[PDB]
């Protein structure tokens, strides 16, 4: 896989962000994770986490996996990096997302994310508290 440029347009919630990619505004849904909705427990904390991570970044990158690049709602499906740190993994590592939505063919970072989740669970962080 490879990283491609994007710029932030706006934070949305824990696992969705609006980015400008190839010069076009798109909502991206983060691969392989599920944050709680804003109205659910830890929802706001996930939203804030992602917000801070993407707003503070000098350099946002999009990395598509090998399979489907857009979902049925027209959201881009990607691993999103903020100054080289993967947002998807960071959420999981902090117990602010679950590994989830693991479909065959867009599952390249699965084992990296599961290892993060196991460590979050060990530490009994947030969702695992
Ligand atoms: C993360 C992800 C979600 N989705 C779809 C599945 C879910 O369909 P349903 O809307 O029918 O439940 C929805 C979950 O996204 P949200 O967690 O953003 O709601 O998005 C994909 O199709 N592919 C993916 O990789
Ligand atoms: Ca969600």
Domains of the chain plus CATH, in order, are: 1-129 (2.40.50.90)
Question: What three-state secondary structure class fits 76?
Answer: strand
Nearest to 61 by CA among 82, 92, 30, 33: 82
C-alpha 116 – ligand 1 centre gap (Å): 21
First and final C-alpha spacing in the chain: 34
Entry resolution (Å): 1.6
Q: Helices (DSSP H) in 23-72: which residue ranges? A: 43-56
101 Cβ below 6 A of ligand 1: yes
Solved with = X-ray
- Residues at the binding site for Ca(2+) are 15, 34-35
Look at the alpha carbons of 66, 107, 69, 89 in this order and tell me if their dihedral is positive or negative: negative
- Residues at the binding site are 15, 34-35
Contact 9, 25 (CB under 8 A): yes
| Dihedral pair phi/psi, residue 60, rounded to 5° | -95, 135
Helix%, strand%, coil% for the chain, nearest 5: 30, 30, 40
How far apart (Å, rounded) are the C-alpha atoms in residues 92 and 30?
11
Q: Catalytic residues, which ones?
A: 29, 37, 75
Nearest ligand to the C-alpha of residue 47? Answer: 2
List the residue whose alpha carbon is closest to atom 17 of ligand 1.
34
């Amino acid at each position: 896989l490879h990283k491609e440029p994007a710029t932030l347009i706006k934070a949305i919630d824990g696992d969705t962000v609006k980015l400008m990619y190839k010069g076009q505004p798109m909502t991206f849904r983060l691969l392989l994770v599920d944050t709680p909705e804003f109205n659910e427990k830890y929802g706001p904390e996930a939203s804030a986490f992602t917000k801070k991570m993407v707003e503070n970044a000098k350099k946002i990158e999009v990395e598509f996996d090998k399979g489907q690049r857009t979902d049925k709602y027209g959201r881009g499906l990607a691993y999103i990096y903020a100054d080289g740190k993967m947002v998807n993994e960071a959420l999981v590592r902090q117990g602010l997302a679950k590994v989830a939505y693991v479909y065959k063919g867009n599952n390249t970072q699965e084992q990296l994310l599961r290892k993060a989740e196991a460590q979050a669970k060990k530490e009994k962080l947030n969702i695992w508290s």
